Design a protein around this nucleic acid. Structure first.
Ligand SMILES: [Mg+2]
Ligand SMILES: [Mg+2]
Ligand SMILES: [Mg+2]
Ligand SMILES: [Mg+2]
Ligand SMILES: [Mg+2]
Ligand SMILES: [Mg+2]
Ligand SMILES: [Mg+2]
Ligand SMILES: [Mg+2]
Ligand SMILES: [Mg+2]
Ligand SMILES: [Mg+2]
Ligand SMILES: [Mg+2]
Ligand SMILES: [Mg+2]
Ligand SMILES: [Mg+2]
Ligand SMILES: [Mg+2]
Ligand SMILES: [Mg+2]
Ligand SMILES: [Mg+2]
Ligand SMILES: [Mg+2]
Ligand SMILES: [Mg+2]
Ligand SMILES: [Mg+2]
Ligand SMILES: [Mg+2]
Ligand SMILES: [Mg+2]
Ligand SMILES: [Mg+2]
Ligand SMILES: [Mg+2]
Ligand SMILES: [Mg+2]
Ligand SMILES: [Mg+2]
Ligand SMILES: [Mg+2]
Ligand SMILES: [Mg+2]
Ligand SMILES: [Mg+2]
Ligand SMILES: [Mg+2]
Lengths: 107, 67, 223, 57, 96
RNA sequence: ACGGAAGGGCACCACCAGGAGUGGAGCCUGCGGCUUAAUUUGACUCAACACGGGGAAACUCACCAGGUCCAGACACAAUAAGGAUUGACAGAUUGAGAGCUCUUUCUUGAUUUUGUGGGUGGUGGUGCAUGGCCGUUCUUAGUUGGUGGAGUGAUUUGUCUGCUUAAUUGCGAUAACGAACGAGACCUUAACCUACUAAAUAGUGGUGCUAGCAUUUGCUGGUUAUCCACUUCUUAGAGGGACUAUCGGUUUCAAGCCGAUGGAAGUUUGAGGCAAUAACAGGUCUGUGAUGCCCUUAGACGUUCUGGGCCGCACGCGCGCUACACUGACGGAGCCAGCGAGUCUAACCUUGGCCGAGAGGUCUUGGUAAUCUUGUGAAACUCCGUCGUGCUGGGGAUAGAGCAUUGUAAUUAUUGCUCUUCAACGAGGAAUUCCUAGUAAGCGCAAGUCAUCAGCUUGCGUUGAUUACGUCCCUGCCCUUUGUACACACC
């Protein structure tokens, strides 16, 4: 005999959308499959990490420049569910690359 | 230039060679045809193809075409 | 604790890089290839994908014991907070890096030049690759530098399918007289792609109609 | 290598690869000193193993 | 190198415990994480211990990775006069 | 493969037709030269000269004047517990509170010292020994195999007159047929979705609470939850969309190309990423704990420490910046972007409040960030004034005097502010650069660098044209033909 609501926030962040979106729509389909109360995936502006560099190790040549970029996708989903499922839901839905973060609190 | 690559024209040839009943002078249906009837890897290439089989269609209607 | 998201994901990537280096240096004579981090609650799961795990492992479980400790003490985990595992790789023949260090170990074990690559090509092809390439760019026996293209089968070289299908590996083999470059290319058969696009974007297959017997004046059936 | 000994290269490379295929098919089946470190300096911690005195003038 | 026995032991000792040492390529660190001596003292100490075999060294990305080996085991066994079947990193932990 | 033979092409790193310029001036910045203790060095046609991400006050750093230290593994040997070796107070000394060395006399214990062998570092040489990476050829369109045809053979044909394309892109011609690499496909980004899934980290309408002006209802605000609703705008997952579409001119009525209509979009949708075979003694051992060999290794070419130098100034060259004014300068006043970035074992991005003319200071404060800085109220530009063609209030070099910030350090003035001083330049000789649409040009911004320093760079948005829609005249390459006694291939 236990259990109590919490008003939870799960943030998902990664560089491989397909996994991200995999774990993201998993959380939603799954925990709503057992009727919770949620605010669905909120996608934040996928921010872009640029790096511009001369290709040359030296100085010679037409000065070719070249930019690398890495993409940081972030999501979050809000839940209100007893302690059990949350702990269940945090340990599982594990995925190499997707960064899960679960805060608590309505403040 | 809008000259269509061989794989476009090549495939079109094949499609008309074996699916003239089915197909029309309408691109849009010729396009939806191309899905159920062939394995193309991309939307863009498929339309590039469909539009050309559609082209060769309107041509045949007013006289056979070589190949 | 307490980091930028931006700062972190980059920070992770560097962590990867250093980690993959250290193993690549450390597990050559074991045919090391790749890592994968798998972070969890309570653990961090480094998985060493070499070919000869028995050597990675060590007497009733040493060496990986050493290697853990190592990885551990440096990045400053807290004994137990990180864990290691050996995982013989499904057919080494389709890992560029696997066959790179092969030829390193071919030439370096006093082997003919073409016997090295023409072997490596043969084994790689025989392993079910759809295409393979071996550059040997360097200097052998004679003073001047040369290079040599060794290849067989089918490769593509441009755009996105490259990312998808061809694996690349360079390796610097330091011999008596100078060094040379080994450069390996495997192109994996897009057919078997499993996770991903299962062909060349080039690929346009027609489904083959059907012989039909027409005629037959109308008639309807009941049910 | 020279293009005049070429055959004998390809062949020796072919068989080189049959040798690799052999090892990898014989791999589809093929074939405690305790006391501890901090514990021996704790078990031999039973001292009377030094001396100390001085200080005068 | 030139270094008092105290700092020698604390390295040799610690090595026999962990069978593993790591340290950054930066001399003048004054004291390093884990062992209690000068960073200098560590790096060269092992280097000596390596050049007579005993232990191997490995570099990459600015940190030395030192691995004690079987012959070193007996040598350290000697320089700490511990009896055979003493210790190393050669314990399989608890059930871990 | 090459030609200082012929024939074709292709391109704003070619011209046409134009723009906006550089070339002249002041300064900024690189290169040379000169000078110097040293003024570290690489690179010299496109393809060296705001390049080595090279904005050097120490560091960096390689240069110069000097000063310490070994971080000289290991092996043999020698020394040697009657002490192999280590350290030092003060003084002398020195730039120095370096026991460097010296006076002096404790200390230290087998870690060192000495010798040889062998190692080891090195921004020492060699990029003409190499790897790797890069640049160039290349704003290019080239490479190859199966079955067949020719040839004793090396080989050729396929891969070609023509047409077409940005394209060996295609049509067509055809002893070839049918394909593969590369081009295309693909991928990323900017464009279209009142369709889909949603959002107090985005926003809308309604309602409460509430302010001002009107009152007859109205107009314009306030209130990160007082509630209800929505997803047009914003965000990003999944889809959809365009295939040069319909119609018509034009052409071997072929590939195509041109025009109108419709369309978010019809120049490869615009812009990128990727990119075959091959070539160069291109650049880089000064990015690498990549590396061969050579040199060097304790009076070091190792390293560190103090100080200078890379900035040095008769002068040649290159990239730039600011200007010569009135389509303007100033002074009020309006007031509008986008790509970014930000502090953990920390001192990053900074709102607000005060104080200070200013630069700044000071108290707090929000933000690890679609949540705070920030609506980055940016600059051109818009408006009402002042000035009125006069080197003028255009212009702001050079110079003095003061304040203040970064930093251990600001002198050879890091930067910022005030006052003053107020040059040359009145549109620039021969020459030469870049460019065809949201482009050119004008205009700021963030990011890299960064303690402090952008006259640089990489991206970004803002305002927004004139003139081509051509050609082979110039120059550059490509192709074919052709000659060759070249093949290490006209160096
Ligand atoms: Mg292709
Ligand atoms: Mg492409
Ligand atoms: Mg002209
Ligand atoms: Mg002009
Ligand atoms: Mg100057
Ligand atoms: Mg100095
Ligand atoms: Mg010696
Ligand atoms: Mg010697
Ligand atoms: Mg070096
Ligand atoms: Mg070269
Ligand atoms: Mg090279
Ligand atoms: Mg040179
Ligand atoms: Mg052009
Ligand atoms: Mg024949
Ligand atoms: Mg030809
Ligand atoms: Mg919407
Ligand atoms: Mg219209
Ligand atoms: Mg040269
Ligand atoms: Mg290099
Ligand atoms: Mg300079
Ligand atoms: Mg330049
Ligand atoms: Mg004004
Ligand atoms: Mg005052
Ligand atoms: Mg705070
Ligand atoms: Mg005046
Ligand atoms: Mg003025
Ligand atoms: Mg800046
Ligand atoms: Mg610069
Ligand atoms: Mg000839």
């Amino acid at each position: 005999q236990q259990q109590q609501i919490i008003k939870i926030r799960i943030t998902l962040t990664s560089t491989k959308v397909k996994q991200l979106e995999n774990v993201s729509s998993n959380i939603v389909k799954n925990a709503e499959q057992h009727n919770l109360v949620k605010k669905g995936p909120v996608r934040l502006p996928t921010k872009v990490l640029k790096i511009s560099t001369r290709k040359t190790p030296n100085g010679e040549g037409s000065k070719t420049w070249e930019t690398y970029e890495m993409r940081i996708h972030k999501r979050y989903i809000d839940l209100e569910a007893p302690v059990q499922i949350v702990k269940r839901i945090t340990q599982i839905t594990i995925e190499p690359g997707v960064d899960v973060e679960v805060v608590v609190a309505s403040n | 230039g809008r000259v269509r690559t061989k794989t476009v024209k090549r495939a079109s040839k094949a499609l008309i060679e074996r699916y003239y009943p089915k197909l029309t002078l309408d691109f849009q249906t010729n396009k939806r045809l191309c899905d159920e009837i062939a394995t193309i890897q991309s939307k863009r290439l498929r339309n590039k193809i469909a539009g050309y089989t559609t082209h060769l269609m309107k041509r045949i209607q007013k006289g056979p075409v070589r190949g | 604790a307490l980091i930028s998201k931006k700062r972190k994901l980059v920070a992770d990537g560097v962590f990867y890089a250093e980690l993959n280096e250290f193993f690549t240096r450390e597990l050559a004579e074991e045919g090391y290839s790749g890592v994968e981090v798998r972070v969890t609650p309570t653990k961090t799961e480094v998985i060493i994908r070499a070919t000869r795990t028995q050597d990675v492992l060590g007497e009733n479980g040493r060496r990986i014991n050493e290697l853990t400790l190592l990885v551990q003490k440096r990045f400053k985990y807290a004994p137990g907070t990180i864990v290691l595992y050996a995982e013989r790789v499904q057919d080494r023949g389709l890992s560029a890096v696997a066959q790179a260090e092969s030829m390193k170990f071919k030439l370096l074990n006093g082997l003919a030049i073409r016997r090295a690559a023409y072997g490596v090509v043969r084994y790689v092809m025989e392993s079910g690759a759809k295409g393979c390439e071996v550059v040997v760019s360097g200097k052998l026996r004679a003073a001047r530098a040369k290079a040599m293209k060794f290849a067989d089968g089918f490769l593509i070289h441009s755009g996105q399918p490259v990312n998808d299908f061809i694996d690349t590996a360079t390796r610097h083999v330091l011999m008596r007289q100078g060094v040379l470059g080994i450069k390996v290319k495997i192109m994996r058969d897009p057919a078997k792609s499993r996770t991903g696009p299962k062909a060349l974007p080039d690929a346009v297959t027609i489904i083959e109609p059907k012989e039909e017997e027409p005629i037959l004046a109308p008639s309807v059936k009941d049910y | 290598g020279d293009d005049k000994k070429e055959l004998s290269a390809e062949k020796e490379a072919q068989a080189d690869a049959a040798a690799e295929i052999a090892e990898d098919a014989a791999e589809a089946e093929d074939a405690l000193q305790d006391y501890l470190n901090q514990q021996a300096n704790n078990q031999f911690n039973k001292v009377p193993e030094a001396k100390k005195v001085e200080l005068d003038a | 190198m030139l270094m008092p026995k105290e700092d020698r032991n604390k390295i040799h000792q610690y090595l026999f415990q962990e069978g593993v040492v790591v340290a950054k390529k930066d001399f003048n660190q004054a004291k390093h994480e884990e062992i209690d001596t000068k960073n200098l003292y560590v790096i060269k100490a092992l280097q000596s211990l390596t050049s007579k075999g005993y232990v191997k060294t490995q570099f990459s990305w600015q940190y030395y990775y030192y691995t004690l080996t079987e012959e070193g085991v007996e040598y350290l066994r000697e320089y700490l006069n511990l009896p055979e079947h003493i210790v190393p990193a050669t314990y399989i932990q608890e059930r871990n």
